[PDB]
Amino acid sequence: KNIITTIDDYARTQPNNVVYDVQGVTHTYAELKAYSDALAAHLDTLDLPAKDPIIVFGGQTFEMIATFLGVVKSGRAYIPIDTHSPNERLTMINEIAKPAAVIAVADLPTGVGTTPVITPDQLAAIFATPVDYQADHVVSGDDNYYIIFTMPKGVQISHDNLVSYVDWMLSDDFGLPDQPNSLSQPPYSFDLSVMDVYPTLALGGTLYALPKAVTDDFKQLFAALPTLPINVWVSTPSFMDICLLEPKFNAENLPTLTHFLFCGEELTHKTAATLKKRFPDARIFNTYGPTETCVAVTQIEITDAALAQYDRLPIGYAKADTRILVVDENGEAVPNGTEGELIIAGPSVSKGYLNNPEKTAKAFFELDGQPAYHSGDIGTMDADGLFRYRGRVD
Ligand SMILES: Nc1ncnc2c1ncn2[C@@H]1O[C@H](COP(=O)(O)O)[C@@H](O)[C@H]1O
């Protein structure tokens, strides 16, 4: 009913199930609740400015996920920033978001002004300080859960925003396995990482993470992939083009893989077809959606029949609870098959950009009493409700 409670509950029912694995380093669902309980208790002690979000700075280690959960457990949203982003990223966001604190899962490469910092050693000490924690004031409802920055703009995603997204991924559109084993390659500063983080966590699965050092080195990456017992794949189409440079990337060397999930770029017919050849018995999905409406809002299963019917791959069909439509420069409905701007309304739409009211007023509006978003995207929709992506209004 609350995603934090769902995840905490897996600590009680499957304490010893592995939840995270980085190149052979593993942690359990029990240690995840214990770490995030310990962090939350500690933040409760600091009397931090309430609502004010916390920046979480780091790469792809377990502590990243543990830290997120302790922050939302404390009542506040987390802002994830990746180690391999330039230093001014952390300076800009700190200046725009005015966070209550920065938690340095990885060492900060630069200072963050007056924002208090918890060092990696201090964080280590907190996680090793077990508490018996009442999670009585966790993030819930319309309150900010994460703020992911795209200038860069801080997309505020509430708890209920994320559940609209998560519920869709757990539905029969995708048929994800129970307790999935999922790849975690997109850095957590990126929206797409959510597509593997929270559907796996809601389902009690396990995250098999790749640090950037591995993806920076095709030798290492090609060597690493067969060692991961993953069922669910999440990445950009371009990253899959890299992995397909390996003839060995196929169902015989990766027998556990059953679901491929792509977002963030156009999936070319050549990429989907090479992959259909490599993994003929898997299910492949194209998805699309702006960060401002929580990860994705359309999907289409690229079946054999899809590959033969479509040259360019469509972006698919809307979530049941999300209303999508195509309008012209005046905000008026555009006929089926005519190009216009894609408008998105429903429960996953962000309440707006943090500390940027001018962008929020231009992009976000209300549609029949639902929050609605101007994507910058041109596309089409036929009468069957199938969407296609056709460029940007910019
Ligand atoms: N599967 C996809 N096919 C085509 N364009 C996409 C897809 N996924 C994301 N994009 C584009 O990426 C840009 C930013 O939106 P998004 O990355 O979906 O948040 C927009 O141009 C999107 O339409």
Numbering used by the authors: 3 to 152, 158 to 401
What does the paper say about this structure?
TA d-alanylation is performed by the Dlt pathway, which starts in the cytoplasm and continues extracellularly after d-Ala transportation through the membrane. The first step in the d-alanylation mechanism of TA is the transfer of the phosphopantetheinyl moiety of coenzyme A (Ppant) to the DltC protein by the Phosphopantetheinyl transferase AcpS. The d-alanine-d-alanyl carrier protein ligase (DltA) catalyzes a two-step reaction: the activation of d-Ala using ATP to form a d-alanyl-AMP intermediate and then the transfer of d-Ala as a thiol ester to the Ppant group of DltC. Altogether, we conclude that DltC1 acts as an interaction hub for all the successive cytoplasmic steps of the TA d-alanylation pathway.
